[PDB]
Design a protein around this nucleic acid. Structure first.
Lengths: 333, 293, 49
RNA sequence: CUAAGAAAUUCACGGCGGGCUUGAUGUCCGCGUCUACCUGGUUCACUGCCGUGUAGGCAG
């Protein structure tokens, strides 16, 4: 019994790109016609405010050049004047079938992985995982910065079976926090739906409407790019904003990131709250990877302890391994 | 222990675009429905615009945004740099209140520091500022820029409530949302000075506005501990601070009071730069930037 | 023939048109999710194809 | 003082004809780019102003 040198896992919980619009509160009986927001590429001067080097420093090229200001092209999208609330709208497919890999090499290893994930499901299902995914869909965590300092947020999650809506929700979510995972009965009703989705027991298509009051004409935070490596000229392109057709947009992977903030069973900052589920669990903006392979805690040690040698880990490391198997990726060798 | 290869701080008191618009007097209490300003070009091919004959008035429109808890950063590579920065930021927080920043913010709110070139030959300045919770206002003010002189920081009776409100704001004791708007006295048929990009005056469509960074500059004229001569007045807060208008760059790096060495000393090895430097340090932490290696 | 594209779909319909000239000579429609992915069971409009 | 010292290779030409390369196929799988800001460059070292000649009230 050995691990197959080519593994692969189709992801579940598929989000799309979100699209921003704008308008006022209490016109949400008829808010299906709000205009979108516009990515605005302009040119705005800056300051000379970075660390001057220690390599070849010279007041003939730093103390003379400091008093000559900067010349840049910032790209910022902003709200209109009468508008005061971002509507961030996307859809989400809870697929299910979340224990069988797409690729393999050894069907003995696949016969072991299937019965291992089935022995996982048949005592604790997808219940608590869908509780915490329903929490991340409840609070506006997928507004990574557009919620920070808000007055009220309103989260309407619509379940869809046909052309129209089959089930509604409304969540107060500035009351709901980002560390303590308390719950409610309608949060439980969302979680039962997502647990039916992940268990292969039906189709789930959640149209997610998430309002967030910021203020009149304020600044909005879409996603960003990587502009290099295929035509890297002298560098006259500072930072632009992501867009589907002439309207600003969040990527799908950032919303997927903000939805899989499930991990609370790592020994670094336990009370300080959840982070994203990643193998070698790392917040790279923090700069320090939790869950080192120096210890016994990462996914690539848990997985082949639990599959090969039957050493079933603790009843939260099971949750972490299954959050990885819903994540996807290239495993194996 | 050493420096921080990446750093990213988040902005406070961000305004919107200050659109210009016109009107008259004794209709300033009916200024929900009011006209705007126009943009035209004349004979080179450059832009220059003008008020009408019925109007000495010009109008300003923007609103503000505190966040709270600005010491804690959002991008680093060293966990130990966070573990050495937390003691310093908490040491500055717990031993004294933030009202010294707040007076020097809120008088620029109260004065015409944001009406920079809107009183080059004016006579009577009247500014009105709103504290908006919801669909109405509930703590209204109306301030004056004649009283407090534009180079000193001498406080008045209106200033302490707004100062303790904004100090509740940026410290995390409650989110505030100001709307700071102004009404001007320009001249019956007078030339305007809006912004530009990097001639074309910067024209928002069917109006005229100046960008975010000019007011996000104007509301943080907090550097008046710059070394050479303190009788001049307040200039804004910049790491490696260079100014075109007064020409000479304050706070040179070849002597030890620039931000990139007092941050090294105040943060890491717990030795203190001066108490006549602290509000400039925390104003640099309010501004934000890429403070690397 | 929809490999990953059919997985997790509400409705999937297949339209098959026999072309014997410029014009179409016959027209089928199917409920692809009703017809089994596993079993080759039979009925009338399918063995008409 | 050199295996030293010296020297005209000339002329001509038909390569030519022919041809089936065939047939088959799953590239799958995953991802937070992050923060920051003051052009009235002088968009001509002066446009346009009583005499085309060197003194002048103007939108400054």
């Amino acid at each position: 019994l050995s691990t197959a040198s080519v593994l692969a896992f189709e992801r579940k919980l598929d989000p799309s790109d979100a699209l921003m619009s704008a308008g006022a509160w209490a016109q949400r009986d008829a808010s299906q016609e709000w205009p979108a927001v516009t990515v605005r590429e302009k040119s705005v001067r800056g300051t000379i405010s970075n660390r001057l080097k220690t390599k070849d420093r010279d007041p003939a090229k730093l103390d003379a050049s400091i008093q000559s200001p900067n010349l840049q092209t910032v790209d910022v999208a902003n709200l209109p004047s009468d508008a005061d609330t971002l509507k961030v709208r996307f859809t989400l497919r809870v697929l299910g079938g979340a224990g069988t890999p797409s690729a393999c090499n050894d069907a003995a290893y696949r016969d072991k992985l299937l019965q291992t994930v089935a022995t996982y499901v048949n005592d604790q299902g997808f219940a608590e995982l869908a509780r915490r995914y329903a929490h991340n869909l409840a609070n506006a965590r997928f507004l990574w910065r557009n919620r920070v300092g808000a007055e009220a947020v309103e989260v309407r999650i619509n379940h869809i079976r046909q052309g129209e809506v089959a089930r509604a929700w409304r969540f107060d979510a500035l009351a709901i926090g980002l560390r303590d995972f308390k719950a409610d009965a309608e949060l439980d009703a969302l979680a039962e739906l997502i647990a039916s989705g992940l268990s292969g027991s039906g189709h789930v298509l959640l149209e997610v409407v998430a309002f967030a009051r910021i203020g009149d004409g304020q600044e909005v935070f879409p996603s960003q790019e990587l502009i290099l490596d295929k035509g890297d000229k002298k560098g006259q392109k500072s930072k632009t904003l992501y867009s589907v057709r002439d309207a600003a947009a969040i990527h799908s992977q950032k919303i997927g990131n903000a939805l899989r903030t499930i991990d609370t069973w790592y020994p670094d900052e336990d009370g300080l709250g959840p982070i994203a589920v990643e193998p070698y669990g790392s917040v790279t903006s923090q700069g320090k990877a939790y869950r080192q392979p120096k210890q016994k805690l990462d996914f690539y040690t848990l997985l082949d302890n639990w599959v090969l040698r039957d050493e079933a880990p603790a009843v939260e490391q099971q949750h972490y391994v299954i959050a990885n198997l819903i994540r996807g990726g290239v495993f194996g060798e």
